[model samples]
Structures are given as C-alpha cells and as structure tokens.
Target chain A: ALATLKGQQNRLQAEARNLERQSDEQKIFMKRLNTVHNTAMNLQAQIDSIQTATSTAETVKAMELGTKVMDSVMEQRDQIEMMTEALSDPS
Target chain B: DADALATLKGQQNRLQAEARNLERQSDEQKILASKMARQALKRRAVFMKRLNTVHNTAMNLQAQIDSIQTATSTAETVKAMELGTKVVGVMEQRDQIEM
Candidate 1:
C-alpha cells in the first residue's frame, strides 16, 4: 500500500511539472502577442496623421512631405505585419 | 489506501483537462496572430505605393519651379519671388516625407 501511494504521488508530481511547463510557454506567447499588437496600433496612428496632413496642405512641398511621411508609415506597417504574422503562425 | 488512490486519480484527471484546455487556447491564439499579420502586411504595401506616387509628384513639381526660377533675369527678383515659390515647393515636399 505504501509503495502504491508513493507511485501515485510521483505521477501527480510529474503531471504538475508538465502543466507548469505548458503554462510558461503560453505566457510567453501571450506576451509576444501583446507586444506586436501594441506596435501595430502605434504605426496605424502615424499613418493616419500622415494622411490627414497630406489632405490639408496647400503647397506641393507639403504634399511631397506627406508622401514621404506616408512612406515611413508604410515601412513601419510592414514590420508590424511581419511581426503579427510571426505571432499568428502555429509553428 | 484505496481512497487515497481515488483522490490522486481525480486530481490527475483535472490537471489533464486543464492542460488540454490551455493547448486549445494556444492554438486559437496562434491562428488569430497569423491572420492579423497578413492583413497588416497588405495594408503596408498599399500605403507605401501611395506615398511613392506623392513623392514623385512633388519631385516633378519642384523641378518645374526650379526651371521657372532659372529663367528669371534679375538676381533680386529671382531671390525674392522665385525663391519663395521654391521654398514653398520644398516645404510641400518635406511635408510628404513624414517619419
């Protein structure tokens, strides 16, 4: 009986360890997801600003600047997208 | 001893179920992340193309303004009137080059 009880205790310990490891992994994934989400959101805001300025400016120079700004926004957006894709993939 | 074994089995089952649930949730999250990433990439590409168009247009406009200024005879007039036009053109270009 004592031996049986010891075996059960060991099984429980092993299961708990496995669960803990799984939880840790999930936590890491969640953290990465949050980071990517935040980055994407920030880039979106910059894009909006560039668009707004582009529409309002009266001069060709202003429009050109707006275009450049938009380009930067595009670059940032690309990075955000890549990160998000990485976050989403199962592998 | 039998009762102890039964309790242990129950605990094991609960843990197993919890672990499975976590696995399912993780899978779902991964799927969501992938979808979002692809969408973001698409949007970025479109935005970049639009910006490029704007940039090219500004460059051509500046060149046109520069040619006009060069046609002027008097240094004073060119410095006064043409310079302002060129400055405005450059400003417009700068506005497009957002960080």
Candidate 2:
C-alpha cells in the first residue's frame, strides 16, 4: 500500500541527484564551451558533468548531452511536484 | 493527534540535529583518519543517508495517520452531537404532549 510513497521518495531522490548533475553540467559547460569556442577547444563530444549523476531519467532519455540539460529542467519540474506534496495546502 | 504530531516533529528535529552533529564528528574523524584507508571513510560515509530515510519515513507515516485519525474522529463526534440533539428534541416533544 505504501509502496507508492517509497517509489515517490526514490524518484524525488533521483530528481535531487539529477538537479545537482544539471547544475554541475551547466557550470562546466559555461567553462569549457567558452574555452574551446574562444580557442581551438577540442574538448570533443564527451559525456561528462562536474557533478555525479543519479537520475530517474537515466536511459529514460537518449543519454544525450542536450537531453541531460533537459532532464535537469525536468527535475526542476519534479522539484515543483515534490514541493506541492511536501507542503500543506491552506485550509 | 496534537501529541502524536508533536512527538513526530520532535523526533524529526532530534534526528536532524544529531545527524548534523554526527556529521561534524565524522568530518573530524575523517580528517584524522584520512591518511589511513578508503574503506573506513566509505563505511562511515554510509550511515547518514539511510538514517535520514528512516526518520523521514517515520515522520511522514505518523503525520498521515494523525491526519486520518483527526478527520475520522471529528466526523464521528459531529454525528454523535447531531443524534444527541435529536433525542433531546424528541423528549421535549413527549413532555409537551403530556403537559
């Protein structure tokens, strides 16, 4: 019966992990993308982010770089959902 | 319901404050033990997350139960009051008829 709650928590945790991943990705993207763009930056189309990945959407997305940024945006949506659950509605 | 809610909140508070304290102590221990081994640090690294999971689940469960209980008890009391009022009104009608 409470399996749903556990599932929800796992998803929330996953969302949390992925949001951090997104933050780190954006952080580094700004860094190296500019460095390479400014100079002959051959960073390559590698899959890397500054933060660790712990996503519910792993393999759920195409595992593409652009998709990860999208996943983080989705995690922000997840953040909104979780907040709605966490907070009590005014009576 | 208030008592249960208070206790759950209290437990949650203690778990968080204690966990933070433990984290700091572990931080100190890691500083001292950093030169030793990765396994030990890894082992110590493991406790907080699960402890956190436990506390959060317990609090959530208690709060849900309290919410349900309060709602049910309130409805039950309201019905009882309504019935009591009807019975007294019937008794007054009987007394008025006898008079």
Candidate 3:
C-alpha cells in the first residue's frame, strides 16, 4: 500500500511538471503573437504616412518606403500560418 | 502488526485525497489551455485575413502610384487619390482588431 501511494505521488509530480511547462510555453506564444501584432500596426502607420505625402518627389519617396514596409508585412505571413497550424484544434 | 497496518492505511488515504485534488486541478488547467488555444486559433485566422486584405489594397495603391509616375495624366492622378482613400479605409478596419 505504501508503495502504491508513493507511485501515485510520483506520477502526480510528473504531471505537475508537465503542466507547468505547458503553461510557460503558452505564455511565450502569446507574447510573440502580441509582438507580431504591434509590428504590423507600426507598418500600417508607415503606410498612412505614405498616403499623406503631397509633392511628386515626396510621394515617390514615400512609395518606396511603403513598398519596403509591405514586404516586411508579407514576410510575417509564414510565421502567422505556422502559428495557426500549431494552435488549431479541430477536435 | 495491526497498528502498523492501520498507519499504512491512513497514509494511503491521505495520498489518495491528494491525488484527487491534483487531478481536479489538472482538469481545470487543461480546460484553460484548450480555451487559450481556441482563442489563438481564432485570432490567427483573423490576422491572416486582415493581412491579405491589407496586402491587396496596398498592391492596388502601388499600381496606381506606378501609373501616375509613368504617365502623369490627370485621370491617373485622380485614380491614385481614390485608391489612397480606399487604402486608408482598410487600414482603419485593421486598426480595430490588430491589437
């Protein structure tokens, strides 16, 4: 009986360890998601700045900036897709 | 011997109760994890869709800019301005959810 109790205690400890690790992983994932979101918003602000340009020369420069920012935003799609796949729970 | 057996039984009962409590907590944690995962999945979908919308609108604006630069026609300039308005509208929608 003592042996059985010890075994159960050990199992519970192992489970608690696993749960702790899982919770930590979830927190990290959430932080990364927030970072990506903020970066995208900043890029949007850059695009807005581009829209406000007046002179032809200013517009041309702003367009180049817009293109570069858009490229970076496009680059984020792969990571976003990866996260979608990771978090998806169809069951 | 009887007293020793009684002591062992008491220990076993205590262990069993502790195990049950931990099991309940584990179940609760699992429920929370599932909810978080569901939220992440939903947010990911929203994020991807918004990214596409922004990309398409930006591309349209870029095309307009290209035409305006190459020809400098008054009509092309008007079209670029219209597309710029559309781009800002899309950005506003994105602003609501991108946080």
Candidate 4:
C-alpha cells in the first residue's frame, strides 16, 4: 500500500511539472503575438497616410507605391493572424 | 507461514518494478517537455524576424513618401513663382507701350 502511494505521488509531480512548462510557453507565445499585431497596425497607418496625400499624376505614382506598402502589410497581417490563432488554441 | 511470507515478497518485487516503470515514464516526459520548449522558442524567433522585416519596410516606405511629398511641394512652388514672373513681365511691356 505504501509503495502504491509513492508511485501515485511521483506521477502527480511529473504531470504538474509538465503543466507548468506548458503555461510558461503559452505566455511567451502571447507576447510574440502582440508584437506582430502592433507592427501590422503601424504599417496600416502609414498606408492610410500615403493614400490620403496622393492627388495628382505624380501622386498617383505615390498611390501605387502605397498599394505596394499595403500589400506587404496584408501579407504580414495574415502571418500574424495565423500565429495568433495558433497561440490562442489550446493543445 | 512460509507461504504467506513468499506471497508478500512477490508483492514487494512487483511494486518495485512498477516504481521503475514510473520513473522511466517521468524521464520520457522530461524529454518531451524539452522538445516542446525548443519548438516554442523557434516559433517565437521566426515570428519576431518577420515582424522586424515588416517594420523596417514600412519605415523605408514612409521615408520615400516624405521625399516625394517634399519634391512635389517644391516643384509646385517654383511653378507658381514662374507664372508670377511671367505676369509681371507682360504687365511691364504693356506699361512701356502705353508710355
């Protein structure tokens, strides 16, 4: 009976350690997700500013440049979104 | 009495074997935990690298837009000033002809 109790204790301790490690990993993942989210927001803001300033033919060229900027932003946004989703989903 | 003693000894050996198995499983769990930690680190590193690239690209784009805006404004000012000079020259000639 005493041996059985010892075995149960060992198993519980191991499981607890594993759970703690997982919790720490999740916290780090959240931090990385926030960093990506902020970058996406900043890129979007820049695109909006450039688009507003664009007016003439020369500015149309500027708008074209702005579109490229937006394309890059969207690509990053998708990556960040995917990562965030992965982080949020429980394993 | 001897039989009962043998049965107790057998139970004790079985318990010892079970303890060893549990310890082995714990070691395996530790290895798995290490692997999971490494994977999480790699994911974070890759994500951060991509974020930094996006930020740098945005900064460069912003700088280019600023330069364009400045050049455009300067050209506009010069064009307006040239028109003013032309109007002045025409007015001066008209005055001279009237005189």
Candidate with the greatest TM-score versus the true structure: 2
Report per-candidate DockQ.
Answer: 0.02, 0.01, 0.02, 0.02
> Model 4 over residues B9-42: C-alpha lDDT tens digits?
4433544454455455545555665776665455
Ranking by TM-score: 2, 4, 1, 3
Task: Provide the lowest-lDDT 10-residue window in model 4 chain A.
Answer: A51-60
User: Where in model 3 is the C-alpha error above 4 Å?
Assistant: A1-91, B1-36, B73-99
Collision pairs in model 4: none
Candidate 2: list runs displaced more than 4 Å. A1-91, B1-9, B29-36, B65-73, B76-99
Best by lDDT: 4
User: Can you write out model 3's per-residue Cα lDDT over B1-99, one digit (the tens) per residue?
Assistant: 233334434434544454455455545555665776666555555545554554554566557646645664665576777566556545448668888
- Worst lDDT run of 10 residues, candidate 1 chain A, spans A58-67
Query: What's the lDDT for all of these models?
Result: 0.52, 0.53, 0.53, 0.54
Docking class of 2: incorrect
DockQ-based CAPRI category assigned to the predicted complex of candidate 1: incorrect
Scored against the true structure, residue A75 in model 3 reaches a CA lDDT of 57
State TM-scores per candidate.
0.23, 0.29, 0.22, 0.28
Question: How does model 3 fare in lDDT?
Answer: 0.53
- Candidate 4 accuracy as TM-score: 0.28
Give the per-residue lDDT of model 1 (tens digit) for B1-99.
233334434434544454455445545555665776665455545545554555555466458546534553455465666455555444447558874
Candidate 3's residue-wise lDDT over A14-82, tens digit each?
555566667688778444445544555565555445533333345445445544434444556668887
Give Cα distance to truth, residue A64, candidate 4, Å: 4.5
